[PDB]
Amino acid sequence: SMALSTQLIESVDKQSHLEEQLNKSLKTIASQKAAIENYNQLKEDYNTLKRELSDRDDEVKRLREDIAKENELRTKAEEEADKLNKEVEDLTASLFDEANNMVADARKEKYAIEILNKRLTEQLREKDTLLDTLTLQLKNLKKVMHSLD
């Protein structure tokens, strides 16, 4: 039938027309190829980069945290280290006072005695002379006796 026949004839004209245009437009992509190939690469890089940074940032946030603690600690340490470096000046004074005295006291209690000894030692010597004298006073008469009568 001449009916479809025409149609087919037409569905072959339009068809052919496409091959024409397509052949051109598809010929344009072939020109942009490399030019685009080297835009995607960039795009790929740019993206990858975008991630490492999206990470380094999370990290930087993380360190600020950590360096903030450490400080709120070095500070307290430095603190006790001093608060407890004041109390020292005193402590040691006592430590040394009590000790010193402690000793001193004992050492005197020896000294006292030490003295009394020296005393008796001579408080003796004295008596001992009188005696080695009287003993002679007698000895001398007990001779005058055995002479006269």
């Binding site: 470096n85 020292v88 000046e89 040691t92 004074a93 040394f96 006072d97 000790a99 010193n100 000793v103 001193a104 050492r107 005197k108 000294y111």
Partner: protein, 147 residues
Amino acid sequence: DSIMKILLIGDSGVGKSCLLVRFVEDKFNPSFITTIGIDFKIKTVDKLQLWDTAGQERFRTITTAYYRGAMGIILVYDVTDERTFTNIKQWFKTVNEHANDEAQLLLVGDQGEALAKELGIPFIESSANVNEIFFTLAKLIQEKIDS
């Protein structure tokens, strides 16, 4: 009141460390500087806290604590030993950063006179007099509350 807390450093054994034994008459006062590197005596003149130190002894972290408060300071060395003298140099160095350079310092061991005038500080000798050696410092220590 009026207590001049001094601090001797670099004392040399029971030969010089007896510096306090010398400054103090008390014969009943024990002396730990011999065994223990330090000692703590006190006398009265016109009070005087006196932390005597030989530097080289465990309680260095403490002798240091003494610095943060000393009003006077004598650096000492033994004469019969050129070794002690050598330390002297170092001694003053310690006294710097830790202690106070505003408080009256003093050095006491015609040669030493050299390094003596090299620090802008008085000087004497291992005489053995001594009783007046603290009189000096102290005297200047008071010639400080004038401002």
